[PDB]
Design a binder for this molecule. Structure first.
Ligand SMILES: C[C@@H](Oc1cc(-c2cnn(C3CCNCC3)c2)cnc1N)c1c(Cl)ccc(F)c1Cl
Ligand SMILES: [Zn+2]
Ligand SMILES: [Zn+2]
Ligand SMILES: [Zn+2]
Length: 162
């Protein structure tokens, strides 16, 4: 099957808010906010819930800017990653036990300290281009293949449990 995930980028005109994973899986890397969508909540609920827990921020709105599929050789469960961005935050960013938010100038993004697929789709998100992406991995993050398309509009999946 697949597992449903959200990824949220807080993107203001000249800077982006990323979070460093503090402990555990993927520790020491910077990424957007998000996580697994739980049963009982919609995709948008999960994205809002993760951003609140990981950064302490509330959002007025989330823009659907991308979809990514992660596939790992051996695992029959793909990752269905719904990607959102937003520039209408409320509150002050404050770390959780899991993530610490920090602002980054758009021309100083630390790609070497982020997940490898970010080097592909993150520049498209930075240029306000919507995208559909697929990445096949082996191991933690070794890309075997990928395809990345710019889209006019992000296609809806019509998840009826989320
Ligand atoms: C923050 C982000 O980091 C990534 C994790 C992964 C990832 C997560 N898990 N794995 C595998 C590690 C071992 N093999 C099974 C999963 C790779 C791939 N690309 C990423 N950008 C991430 C994570 Cl950590 C989890 C779910 C997501 F939808 C996203 Cl977008
Ligand atoms: Zn479900
Ligand atoms: Zn946006
Ligand atoms: Zn989906």
């Amino acid at each position: 099957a697949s597992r449903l995930y959200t990824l949220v980028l807080v993107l203001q005109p000249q800077r982006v808010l990323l979070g460093m994973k503090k402990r555990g899986f993927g520790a020491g890397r910077w990424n957007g906010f998000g996580g697994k969508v739980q049963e009982g909540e919609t995709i948008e609920d999960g994205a809002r819930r993760e951003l609140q827990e990981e950064s302490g921020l509330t959002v007025d709105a989330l823009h659907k800017v991308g979809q990514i599929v992660f596939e790992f050789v051996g695992e029959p469960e793909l990752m269905d990653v719904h990607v959102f961005c937003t520039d209408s935050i409320q509150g002050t960013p404050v770390e959780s036990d899991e993530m610490r938010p920090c602002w980054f100038q758009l021309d100083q993004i630390p790609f070497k300290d982020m997940w490898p697929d970010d080097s592909y789709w993150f520049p498209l998100l930075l240029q306000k281009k919507k995208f559909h992406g697929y990445f096949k991995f082996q191991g933690q993050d070794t890309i075997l293949d990928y395809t990345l398309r710019e889209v006019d509009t992000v296609l809806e999946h019509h998840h009826h449990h989320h």
